[PDB]
Point group: D2
Chain length 164, copies 4
């Protein structure tokens, strides 16, 4: 019946591209896919609690959740949908800019049938796989929406070096 | 220094999306990428022999070749470029519609640092991973350019069943 | 230089075998490899093919780990300080390879292995085959004896790996 | 129902260990597993943990394979009829798992394993660690003794796995 697939890794690793790659595969076989985006055959939605999707997700074979770390109830949602027979596919950061985990994505790891962690390329040294996201601006808000001028994906030693 | 990464699998598996996912990762780290398409920071090209790229590829860190099975000299090209220090990334069909291999992509398998085979979803039964491409029109031309109205990706047993 | 590779999944998924596969690769290239096992864990021991030690926490290895290129930690969920140990060692240039359960018998995470996920360069989650229905990939471990101790050391005499629906079916009974 | 899983890569990459990891998973779910080895291949034998046989070609197994859920073929490149055997068995509903070299010591493909790639549901290529430089992933096998026999049975006494540039450097010498 149902399942949970989780795609994790730092920023700039292509997690969302991989999520969509997987959604597209299902669409070619005539499966209905519902894509849930965050904001503070097919159907799309931008939302801020998974509670706000209501029961719309039940009309679909495949449910995809992007930026899963922004949703506070994501693990319970995914479990409920997978228990109802859906293929659920989630892309999320596993770690925040302090290399500390998103507790809800932890729960997903433990509930997932598959977990892939993608890597990026180090934006500091340009020579190594990157597994970490470095926040290049001062802020102690955990959630801070932004791109390459506020964050960069780095290798282990560039992360240490830049922590000075 | 250099390497060869190969992405194989049947049609509708998202091989090209995965190739581009990888190219994008490199671009975020300021690496130059040259993309070579078939037709009968960045640069694109449509060509029919890899001979026709000349030595343009030497100006790039990363070389990507799409639809590799259409190029008759692809293995030697990839080896030459990887021996010169390039990251080479190739997407190709491993098997033709008769489940017979493309001999040049065989050579690549043996020369590659990494080989991933993606799956599609079965377009006949809609219930299983698909690893094969079934040609739905009569033709005994090996090369026959087309989409879902001429081909479908199928699972092992749907391929047998449809072979009647 | 250094890195953390994590292998997770339920019981019966071959996590230790994958660990030892990776160690052997390094050994062919003449790299020094140290395997750290948990002293309480009782289960051919492939882990006797290089330098190794049995401890109850990682503090008791002392600084012996510094003498190696590669450090492998088996049954990582048993060690209370595993994340920090791994990070210290990977910061000193070691290739650190850890096998661990990500989830306990209640599908609740081991918090220390959660930290490792976030610190790891590589994370693979292996599957088992459902030992109840025999027809599906299994991602969960089901405890088949009555005990509410979170830690309870054992094998197929006390646990089985199951698919998502077999885990539900068996919990309701 | 049936499938073909292929594990390729150079020597010292742990292909047989991965094969036996997969067999063990199936065994925990009580599935019948048969391991077919090559009679000429001399190299703890994990492959003695289920039903097994040593043959020179696959024809000599006869129909014994039909009694199993899972068939594993080790050193597939030695068998002249391996592709057809695998396809026959996978068409009868078996999970067939093959480990093999994809490339010989000259980086030239084993044609029969090429056919398997095209017939396989899953293909993984494992790497080794470069046994010359000790600093890079290795995807090639280098023969360290003089012999132009394509088939020459041996281990680290006759071969080493190497990265792309170490293979060039050593060929020029
Ligand atoms: C690493 C990190 C990223 N982000 C954001 C930046 C982007 O908008 C988004 C990454 O997709 O999440 C945070 O909010 N906090 C963090 O700690
Ligand atoms: C399976 C198969 C696909 N193709 C084509 C169809 C598409 O144009 C392309 C797949 O990208 O290759 C062939 O030319 N021959 C074949 O046997
Ligand atoms: C799933 C699970 C296993 N175990 C034990 C059984 C084994 O000895 C070890 C896993 O190999 O962990 C626990 O102690 N708690 C649990 O929740
Ligand atoms: C690379 C290579 C290995 N071998 C042998 C050595 C081993 O006995 C077996 C690989 O495990 O294959 C060959 O016979 N020819 C070759 O080209
Ligand atoms: Zn770096
Ligand atoms: Zn089908
Ligand atoms: Zn089950
Ligand atoms: Zn080397």
């Amino acid at each position: 019946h149902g399942r949970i697939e989780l795609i994790i890794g730092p920023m700039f690793a292509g997690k969302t591209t991989e999520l969509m790659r997987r959604v597209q595969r299902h669409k070619h076989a005539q499966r209905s896919c519902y894509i849930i985006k965050y904001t503070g055959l097919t159907a799309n939605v931008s939302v801020s609690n998974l509670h706000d999707v209501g029961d719309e997700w039940r009309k679909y074979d495949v449910i995809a959740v992007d930026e899963g770390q922004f949703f506070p109830d994501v693990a319970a949602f995914c479990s409920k949908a997978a228990d109802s027979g859906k293929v659920v596919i989630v892309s999320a950061l596993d770690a925040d800019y302090l290399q500390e985990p998103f507790e809800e994505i932890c729960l997903l790891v433990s509930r997932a049938d598959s977990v892939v962690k993608l890597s990026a390329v180090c934006m500091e040294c340009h020579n190594r796989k990157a597994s970490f996201t470095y926040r290049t601006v001062k802020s102690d808000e955990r959630k801070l929406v932004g791109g390459s001028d506020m964050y960069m994906s780095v290798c282990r030693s560039c992360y240490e070096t830049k922590r000075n």
